[PDB]
């Protein structure tokens, strides 16, 4: 399978400032979709915790993080994504955001969902607590069950 079926309306995703990447580039990794917005307090407090985790272990643990934004505007998205070091579904792809939001039944943010890029399978919807609870990534990527 793969990551393709998560993105019905996007081909490339952002990798910072203004570039865009292909899904095959995530081959062999775990990919976290990170549902977040700058208007949400706990999101503003968790983002820095997840950046800390990503710096400590993204390379060793072989994973990538993709921002799936619930921000209210193109400008909010930019300012918030600006601070993050990983990927993002492009803000224009609002319907894409809705497809994963309903797909994983995310009802509140922040939420971080772990998926295997090569099979496309889901690891867990509860990585938000795990980044905090297992900062040393001893049980990463925390198969849900």
Rounded to whole angstroms, the Cα distance separating 40 from 54 reads: 21
Q: Are strands 20-21 and 13-15 parallel, antiparallel or unpaired?
A: antiparallel
Residues 6+ apart with CB under 8 A from 8: 95, 96, 99
CB 66 within 8 A of CB 89: yes
How many structural domains comprise the chain?
A: 1
Rounded to whole angstroms, the Cα distance separating 142 from 145 reads: 8
Select from 70, 82, 74 the least CA-distant residue to 110.
70
Which method was it determined by?
Answer: X-ray
Residues 6+ apart with CB under 8 A from 109: 35, 36, 37, 40, 42, 43, 70
Q: Cis ω on the peptide bond leading into residue 109 (within 30° of 0)?
A: no
| Resolution value, angstrom units | 1.9
**Dihedral over alpha carbons 32, 34, 35, 37 (to 10 degrees):** -170
Rounded to whole angstroms, the Cα distance separating 99 from 8 reads: 8
Select from 50, 134, 43, 114 the least CA-distant residue to 80.
43
Q: Which domain holds residue 117?
A: 1-145
Helices (H), 6-144: 41-57, 74-82, 94-104, 127-133
Residue 126, domain CATH? 3.40.30.10
Instruction: Work out the burial of residue 40: count CB atoms within 10 Å of its CB; fewer than 13 is exposed, 13-18 middle, 19 or more buried.
Output: middle
Rounded to whole angstroms, the Cα distance separating 6 from 99 reads: 8
């Amino acid at each position: 399978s793969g990551l393709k079926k998560f993105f019905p309306y996007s081909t490339n995703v952002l990798k910072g400032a203004a570039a865009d990447i292909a899904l095959p580039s995530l081959a062999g990794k775990t990919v976290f979709f990170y549902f977040s917005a700058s208007w949400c307090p706990p999101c503003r407090a968790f983002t820095p915790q997840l950046i800390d985790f990503y710096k400590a272990h993204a390379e060793k643990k072989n994973f990538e993080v993709m921002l799936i934004s619930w921000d209210e505007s193109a400008e909010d998205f930019k300012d918030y994504y600006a601070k993050m070091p990983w990927l993002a579904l492009p803000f224009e792809d609002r319907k894409g955001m809705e497809f994963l939001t309903t797909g994983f039944d995310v009802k509140s943010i922040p939420t971080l969902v772990g998926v295997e890029a090569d099979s496309g399978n889901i690891i867990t919807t509860q990585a938000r607590t795990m980044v905090v609870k297992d900062p040393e990534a001893k049980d990463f990527p925390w198969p849900n069950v």
